[PDB]
């Protein structure tokens, strides 16, 4: 269990993804 469980967020705010491409897949602009 490593490499960023985004499942433990309710959603992920696009605001803390930086350039992380996997982050930018799930995230949500606000």
């Amino acid at each position, epitope marked *: 269990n490593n490499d960023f*469980h985004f499942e433990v967020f309710n*959603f992920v705010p696009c*605001s*803390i993804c*930086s350039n992380n491409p996997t982050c930018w897949a799930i995230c949500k602009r606000i």
Partner: antibody, heavy 125, light 107 residues
Framework: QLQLQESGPGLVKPSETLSLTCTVS??????????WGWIRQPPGKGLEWIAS???????YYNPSLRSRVTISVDTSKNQFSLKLSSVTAADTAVYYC?????????????????WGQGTLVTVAS | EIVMTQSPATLSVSPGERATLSCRAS??????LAWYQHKPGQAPRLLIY???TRATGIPARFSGSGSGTDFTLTISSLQSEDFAVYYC????????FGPGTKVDLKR
């Protein structure tokens, strides 16, 4: 300078809910790219993180506690709160509020800086 | 499931020498590791993040080294002020802390 102050009941009866509030001062919670969280330490056990909340309403959970945690932010009074349901003696602890730096950039950011001074909760019949 | 251990649980150290101190992780955590200082009755304080990076406001006597499974926090020229418990925290997936190690002073 940024400061966090917990406030909440010293005592809560088992099978009921514990609620705490952190009042941040010397900095504003909104707008801000920082999550705001709670960590707890039972007597003679380690630290365990609980949940954090971002101005945007995103909530970062410890999964082992997620089912029991409600965490909210009142951006105007500069206050985030924790509610923990159906408490047991397993929940007696010092509860700290903290600023949670989350970042998924180049160099990850997943820590707490700085903290409040803790408040002792006791779950007692 | 990750699991953080620290050793030794407790450590007595002459005022002035170096206290070398460790954190270990079951699986690997790259360099997603912080260290906190917690003097009793006071608030925890972030010492190092990045597994090597000293947080702003922290003396150069406290340095972190290590990676994957083995980390080490060392306090050179230990002061009496430094007496407290030190926790490590991995952030590979989410925040998990170690049991902590109590640093006592000798005199």
């Amino acid at each position: 300078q940024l400061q966090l102050q917990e406030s909440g009941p010293g005592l809560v009866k088992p099978s009921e809910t514990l609620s705490l509030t952190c009042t941040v001062s010397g900095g504003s919670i909104s707008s801000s790219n920082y999550y705001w969280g709670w960590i707890r330490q039972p007597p003679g056990k380690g630290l365990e993180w609980i949940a954090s909340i971002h101005d945007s309403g995103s909530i970062y959970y410890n999964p082992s506690l997620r089912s029991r945690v409600t965490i909210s932010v009142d951006t105007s009074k500069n206050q985030f709160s924790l509610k923990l349901s159906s408490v047991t003696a397993a929940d007696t602890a010092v509860y700290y509020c903290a600023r949670h730096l989350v970042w998924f950039g180049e160099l990850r950011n997943n820590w707490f800086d700085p903290w409040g001074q803790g408040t002792l909760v006791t779950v007692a019949s | 499931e990750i699991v953080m251990t620290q050793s030794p649980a407790t450590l007595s150290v002459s005022p002035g020498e170096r206290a070398t101190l460790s954190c270990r992780a079951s699986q690997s955590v790259n360099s997603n590791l912080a260290w906190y200082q917690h003097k009793p009755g006071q608030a925890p304080r972030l010492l190092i993040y990045g597994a090597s990076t000293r947080a702003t406001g922290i003396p150069a006597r406290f340095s972190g080294s290590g990676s994957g499974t083995d980390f080490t926090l060392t306090i050179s020229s230990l002061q009496s002020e430094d007496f407290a418990v030190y926790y490590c925290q991995q952030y590979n997936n989410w925040p998990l802390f170690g049991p902590g190690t109590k640093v006592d002073l000798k005199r």
